[PDB]
Amino acid sequence: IYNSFYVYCKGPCQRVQPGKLRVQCSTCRQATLTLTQGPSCWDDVLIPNRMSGECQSPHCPGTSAEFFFKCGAHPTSDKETSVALHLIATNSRNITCITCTDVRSPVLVFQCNSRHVICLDCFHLYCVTRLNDRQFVHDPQLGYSLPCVAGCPNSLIKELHHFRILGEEQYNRYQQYGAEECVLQMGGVLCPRPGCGAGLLPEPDQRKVTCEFAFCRECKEAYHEGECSAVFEAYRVDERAAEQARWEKTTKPCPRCHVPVEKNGGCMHMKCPQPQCRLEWCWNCGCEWNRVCMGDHWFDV
Amino acid sequence: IYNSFYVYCKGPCQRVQPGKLRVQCSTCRQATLTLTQGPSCWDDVLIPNRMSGECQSPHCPGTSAEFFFKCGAHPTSDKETSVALHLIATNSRNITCITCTDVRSPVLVFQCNSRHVICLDCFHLYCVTRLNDRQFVHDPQLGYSLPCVAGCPNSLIKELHHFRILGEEQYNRYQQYGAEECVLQMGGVLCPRPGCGAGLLPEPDQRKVTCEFAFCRECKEAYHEGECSAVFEAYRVDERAAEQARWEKTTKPCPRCHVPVEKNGGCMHMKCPQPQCRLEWCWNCGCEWNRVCMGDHWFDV
Amino acid sequence: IYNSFYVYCKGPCQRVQPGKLRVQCSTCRQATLTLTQGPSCWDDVLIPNRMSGECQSPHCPGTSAEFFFKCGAHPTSDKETSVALHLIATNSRNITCITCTDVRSPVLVFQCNSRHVICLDCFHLYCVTRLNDRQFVHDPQLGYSLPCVAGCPNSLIKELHHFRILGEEQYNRYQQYGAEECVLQMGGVLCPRPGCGAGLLPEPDQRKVTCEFAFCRECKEAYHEGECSAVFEAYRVDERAAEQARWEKTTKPCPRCHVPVEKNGGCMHMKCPQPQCRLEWCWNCGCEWNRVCMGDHWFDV
Amino acid sequence: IYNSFYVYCKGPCQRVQPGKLRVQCSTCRQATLTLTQGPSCWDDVLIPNRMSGECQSPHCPGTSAEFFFKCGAHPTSDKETSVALHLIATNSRNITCITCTDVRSPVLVFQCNSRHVICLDCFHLYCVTRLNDRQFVHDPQLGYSLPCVAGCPNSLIKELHHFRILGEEQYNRYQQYGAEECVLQMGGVLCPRPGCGAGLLPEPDQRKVTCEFAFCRECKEAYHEGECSAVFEAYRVDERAAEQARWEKTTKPCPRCHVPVEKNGGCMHMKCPQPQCRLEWCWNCGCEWNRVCMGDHWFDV
Amino acid sequence: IYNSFYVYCKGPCQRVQPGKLRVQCSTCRQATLTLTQGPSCWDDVLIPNRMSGECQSPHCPGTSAEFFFKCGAHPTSDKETSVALHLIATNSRNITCITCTDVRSPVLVFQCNSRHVICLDCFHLYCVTRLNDRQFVHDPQLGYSLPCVAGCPNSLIKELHHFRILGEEQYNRYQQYGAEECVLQMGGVLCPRPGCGAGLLPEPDQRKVTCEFAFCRECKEAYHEGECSAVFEAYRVDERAAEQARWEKTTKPCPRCHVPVEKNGGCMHMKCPQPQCRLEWCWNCGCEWNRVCMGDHWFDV
Amino acid sequence: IYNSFYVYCKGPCQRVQPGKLRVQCSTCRQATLTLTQGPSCWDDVLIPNRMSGECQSPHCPGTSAEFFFKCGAHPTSDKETSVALHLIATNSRNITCITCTDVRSPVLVFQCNSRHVICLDCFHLYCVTRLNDRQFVHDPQLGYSLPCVAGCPNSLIKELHHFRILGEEQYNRYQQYGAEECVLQMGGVLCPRPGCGAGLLPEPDQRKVTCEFAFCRECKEAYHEGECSAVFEAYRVDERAAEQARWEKTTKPCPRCHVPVEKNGGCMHMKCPQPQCRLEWCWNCGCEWNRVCMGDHWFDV
Ligand SMILES: [Zn+2]
Ligand SMILES: [Zn+2]
Ligand SMILES: [Zn+2]
Ligand SMILES: [Zn+2]
Ligand SMILES: [Zn+2]
Ligand SMILES: [Zn+2]
Ligand SMILES: [Zn+2]
Ligand SMILES: [Zn+2]
Ligand SMILES: [Zn+2]
Ligand SMILES: [Zn+2]
Ligand SMILES: [Zn+2]
Ligand SMILES: [Zn+2]
Ligand SMILES: [Zn+2]
Ligand SMILES: [Zn+2]
Ligand SMILES: [Zn+2]
Ligand SMILES: [Zn+2]
Ligand SMILES: [Zn+2]
Ligand SMILES: [Zn+2]
Ligand SMILES: [Zn+2]
Ligand SMILES: [Zn+2]
Ligand SMILES: [Zn+2]
Ligand SMILES: [Zn+2]
Ligand SMILES: [Zn+2]
Ligand SMILES: [Zn+2]
Ligand SMILES: [Zn+2]
Ligand SMILES: [Zn+2]
Ligand SMILES: [Zn+2]
Ligand SMILES: [Zn+2]
Ligand SMILES: [Zn+2]
Ligand SMILES: [Zn+2]
Ligand SMILES: [Zn+2]
Ligand SMILES: [Zn+2]
Ligand SMILES: [Zn+2]
Ligand SMILES: [Zn+2]
Ligand SMILES: [Zn+2]
Ligand SMILES: [Zn+2]
Ligand SMILES: [Zn+2]
Ligand SMILES: [Zn+2]
Ligand SMILES: [Zn+2]
Ligand SMILES: [Zn+2]
Ligand SMILES: [Zn+2]
Ligand SMILES: [Zn+2]
Ligand SMILES: [Zn+2]
Ligand SMILES: [Zn+2]
Ligand SMILES: [Zn+2]
Ligand SMILES: [Zn+2]
Ligand SMILES: [Zn+2]
Ligand SMILES: [Zn+2]
């Protein structure tokens, strides 16, 4: 199957999962909105009111589309939506990871000029080490983020929900980044347990600190007897692996009548212009258009 | 590569990972203990003092082996150990999952007579739904656990760290199972945030409850506007899939001289008896014995 | 793709092709009939009024389904229907042909007890040789037909459109079988050209006969200088190949929630009973139910 | 197996089939002609007396070769020959079809500069639609033909037996192309049934016309109730697919002694020059020369 | 390609090679003998005058066939024949070697009841160790030989040229087995160099012995400073591997007309009985009979 | 498995085999020498005292490494060493043989500018034919050798043990090349049997010559009745095959921490510079460094 969308499911999955793209009429909130034309890129499904259509509800004049995503690994309730992580894609071309050189799927593609790809396991370790070592980048408008692991300019991650890959515990810490940075510069420490967000002052010599629990100063986990995790000691990129890890009018004949059909951007919905055919079909699957292709890969970029 | 050991790495991975088996002399705590014979089953590496050897440390009389495991996905500090999840194995035979029928690896194998296998994704959902729906089984000696999804007798999970697969947040809740069961039977509710373990009494009609945060009574997550996760509504097993999902003097010739060599249980260390050969080798890999085979698959059962 | 239906397209294909199954309301002849339950076997789509549903047309009280098939290799007009050849199936199990031992697809499966399979190339040659050698079997109710090539009892082909595989020219001759058999028993000959269906009497010695054209008596094609086609000289079956060429409560877990779902006969439409899920899905494809699965493989037997 | 020759078998196959190339002495018509050198291209086997050899018949002085082809799918009588369709080749390089983009075999290769390839299914539909829509090209010397589907100059098909792919019925119509074009320009209609080649005049308003049967004016098949086949409504080529669908002293060492041997054009017969070896062998198969290689692929171009 | 015959090429190959089977008229020694029927087993090509045919030579009355084999890896002179090693076969079924458990080809199949197979590398080492350790079995009629490595009864190798696998040097020693056994029982030693077959008496204490060169007593190679080859120290068979290493009216339809044809023993030459077909073909290859199939696999057992 | 070393095993194998690279302290001859850094090319293991390390023997001051190779196909005694054939390599890139065009492994790579590769079967035949036809090249310093089969300049083989591929018998003859060339230029003949190296004078007309055995003058094997081996009659290279048969700061991330690690020449031993990791690993295998990688592929060039 072809998945062009990945979401962060906060529960029950608590991880990145293939998602289902859905539409509804923005005015009556019903699944009765038939699109004039399908979405062809992320902006079409992320920016309010980008796209128009016809509501088939009885007395609804609604004309605007409202998109949302759902985790596909299990049943979901009506409003159990998840956030789309648009940087994450199926690794069709089998691009190697910039860090581990393995071919993995799905992958995260940075918005740097080179479009470097990183597997999720490596992105996770990247975020965790930068968080622990206080190496996130402050952006006054966005907040705290990270660029491409290669340190390319103009690659700061903008959709901050990608940091959900940190994990529940670490993500909460990340949400407190600004506050903790303050506490630290005064020589203080922040209790890591979520409920108790209490500030604490210990002596700069001691590494063990206690609160209303027992935790380690440098590592911020439960106090330990010797040394913190080897990964948390204290960013160089293999020149070859980084080159290998780059992410790099189109028509196709109608599957039924073979007349050339023009593709609209990344949109997978094809409409045959031939008046005796008029086949509506999926660019990827070659079959007639249907709800599965819509949910799984309405567009791909 | 062949991994016979899986551990729960609490950080930085925060998930199940292939582990490395290590030995040290129990008396001097140094990696100088040469085993008289290798471990051949889980009891040999889990039960204190099961196995004997020779310490090569200067003045150490130590003769007993002490085993421990480490996450292999990243560097680890000297005492960064992880707990072995002995129910989890590589799915070599490509057994289907009892629940989803997919072939996955690694898998968890229950200790029921049928040895049913379940993929980790499904085991995770199983634990999460049973936790939320308060369907764990109390065992006075062990604590709270779950049997095989098929409900087979004598299949209660004994090594409770397998529930780490719940996730950090859910695992903490699970650790409070006995306490919360008390609070619930009095009609009370337990605050879900880890720091604030505060008991709370609301009216039995209301679903929204507030504490020193805003959460949902039935779901125990942040309060939501409509209905809880579809998976948390309120155990039948597909008869075919369950049958498909079952887990079912041995010698081999020396790779060098071809004399038959007897295998000792699940131990992968083979010792050729032929006096002009004496090859020490790996049952699985066919190469001479070395530290990689020891760490990755010293034994397999 | 999975095709469970094959039709004879009379034009433009003039051959056996994968077909599309369609439904309409029998009373208003519109594609507005939603089936109460899908077809599960050939009788459900071949026998009038077998199945019931709901017409969604404005003022239509229609409740009965009317099925028809269309060639799928090209656009078709509204009423360009083709006849289903229900003996013909995809060779999923890779059964060898009873005659040539090759694995081919699709294949024709005879209705003999052994369910012998024959590839279409071989079925074609079988029909052509039996036609030329006057070895069709008369059945007073049906007309003229052929049994299994192995000569098994109760294997007479009933849906005579399977003989369309003869080809346009030969099929016309076959349609004249009774008449020609009469002409032949009087020592006469029938002109083979379709327009001129003229009876002709020549001398029993001559093989060349002329009509209002020039054709051969024994072969019924254009007169030739020497001997008829080697295949038309004048039925033994390889015992091994014939054995090899035999065609030999089921549930499956919901792809979304994994509850076991019961299959209804050969019907591919699955309906999850789990009230928080209710997934409608394809037994074969594992995806949610849609128009493609309906057209291509609504049922398979 | 490697087939370099395809023929049209008029019966019993009534379709394109792999053919067998044969030679005989042109003077005694016996299979006793040993070629001085083998054919190396189509002209060598198509043009009378191109090639010389030695007849091994008793008192025959014959020195000239006469080539002919036979269908290989079944036994053939002595003079059951079939016409070679030299445009048709095995698709070894897996070139995509110019129309459907599928990789098929065998394929027809047009004689345009680009050497566009078209699968037989698509060539068939091309001929049928052009025939029905009266879009064949008149060439006073040849007769009626079609160029490359891309409309490339100097691509008119010259060997008209390639139109046999039309089918028996349609081919007869095609043979009447000039006559029917006359009848049509006077506003008349030609009866389609082969025997009755009768001209008919109906009123220009009516579409139904009757003859000494009932047929449709526009479609020329049996009269129908609504609309003609969707393919027969009334030539644009996908620029990408057309580029993809292009068809684009050589020595090889002796398989036995490894001395380099020069290939003669497309001829597969290799003769080792090494005096202690003298191996005669097949360029393609690497085995010694034999009757199978001769029949199946004496040459390939 | 399919090779049913293996020979020992004494030069230039000096090893086991696929061989070519040839026939000639026994009386005129010319390759003009056409077999009445082909060989169907080893006895047919090994035992004089087993098979009859027709000589096509001018005035030769010869009727008896004389078979011989030639190495196929290079050109051979007219009488450059090699000895057939009939125990050696292509390992089509991928039987494991009784000693090394590897799947190799070709293999030697012992004539024990179990038909144990051994790869050539292992057979070679078996012969070499038994030779050096003086463990060949004396058979007064045959000479010196070895049975199956498993020590099965009635498995003594009869065609002694299989010991050519020893190698040129070791084979010469083997040819002197009886003589050397005599020299050894008197406490003497035989010089190993082929030219100098001189008997020598040294003192039973010394291991170094000199002749008209310097060699080792126990090893019979050039004198060495320490210990003989580890393999030459001084027969147990892995029960599983030995079981794994066992070697375990037939008709087929004519490739052209599909009439069942009876196979004659191991003979690959098939003759269709159908009078309008009469195809002569190869059981294995499915193509018409030719010189390549004859040379490579005229029969297989 | 990856083998970078091939040796000539003189017994029991008597052929080219994958070898094991070993090290010892040059002063105490014990396997206690730990290399400061591993070998990175042939010169490091072939030239005395190239490399330094630390002896771990009690009172040994030894600091120099001494390398040697052993046949790996069977047990070897302590000093059973074999000669490394450094021209021979695993054919990883699947280069075709310059002579037979087949892809074989291992292959011999000549030291010509083009680095032509030749499979061992072909190299063997090359040496045998040149030996028999007296076409070896004299080099006053080296002795007698052969260049690249293509006759490229500066390609003379320097390590003469590569001629061991001749075989035991032929190799002895080759060792007598200078002497025999003398005997031949006087019109004399050398007896081929190893023990009897006797010079012999026959009449220049006769081909049969007898000694203290019966052998052929031209062929130097046992006298034969007709013509010598077809290969021994009396060097042209296929231009295409010869082009096809050419043999054509590097870092890699640490498998554990992913920091880029610099490779040292052909050495496979990698040492991670990251102070919290320090993984020692194999470039090829990606696993931690061990005795198997050392023996099989310590370096590769
Ligand atoms: Zn989810
Ligand atoms: Zn609306
Ligand atoms: Zn990665
Ligand atoms: Zn970047
Ligand atoms: Zn706290
Ligand atoms: Zn710490
Ligand atoms: Zn279309
Ligand atoms: Zn799709
Ligand atoms: Zn970890
Ligand atoms: Zn100790
Ligand atoms: Zn599962
Ligand atoms: Zn169970
Ligand atoms: Zn709280
Ligand atoms: Zn809730
Ligand atoms: Zn051994
Ligand atoms: Zn191993
Ligand atoms: Zn059609
Ligand atoms: Zn209706
Ligand atoms: Zn068939
Ligand atoms: Zn039957
Ligand atoms: Zn007529
Ligand atoms: Zn006829
Ligand atoms: Zn469900
Ligand atoms: Zn489906
Ligand atoms: Zn045919
Ligand atoms: Zn003639
Ligand atoms: Zn096509
Ligand atoms: Zn063109
Ligand atoms: Zn008519
Ligand atoms: Zn019409
Ligand atoms: Zn040759
Ligand atoms: Zn060939
Ligand atoms: Zn040979
Ligand atoms: Zn004769
Ligand atoms: Zn073996
Ligand atoms: Zn045996
Ligand atoms: Zn001697
Ligand atoms: Zn010795
Ligand atoms: Zn036949
Ligand atoms: Zn054959
Ligand atoms: Zn060896
Ligand atoms: Zn030393
Ligand atoms: Zn070669
Ligand atoms: Zn060269
Ligand atoms: Zn001599
Ligand atoms: Zn000779
Ligand atoms: Zn590292
Ligand atoms: Zn390695």
Author numbering:
A (entry chain A), B (entry chain A), C (entry chain A), D (entry chain A), E (entry chain A), F (entry chain A): 142 to 353, 362 to 383, 391 to 404, 413 to 465
The study reports:
We generated sufficient yields of soluble protein from human Parkin construct spanning aa 137–465, which was codon-optimized for expression in E. coli. Purified protein was crystallized and the structure was determined to 2.25 Å resolution using the anomalous signal of the eight coordinated zinc atoms from a single anomalous dispersion experiment. The structure of human Parkin UPD-RBR revealed four domains with unanticipated inter-domain interactions. Central to the structure is the UPD (aa 142–227), a previously undescribed elongated Zn-binding fold in which two central anti-parallel β-strands arrange two Zn-coordinating loops. The RING1 domain of Parkin (aa 228–327) is a variation of the canonical RING fold. The C-terminal RING2 domain shows a fold that does not resemble RING domains but rather the Parkin IBR domain. Parkin terminates with a C-terminal Trp462-Phe-Asp-Val465 motif, which is the centrepiece of an extensive (686 Å2) hydrophobic interface with the UPD. Importantly, Cys431 is also located at the interface, buried from solvent, and inaccessible for transthiolation. Superposition of Parkin with RING-E2 complex structures revealed significant steric clashes of E2 with the Parkin linker helix that connects IBR and RING2, as this binds RING1 across its E2 and Ub binding sites. Hence, our structure suggests that the linker helix between IBR and RING2 inhibits E2 and E2∼Ub interaction with RING1.
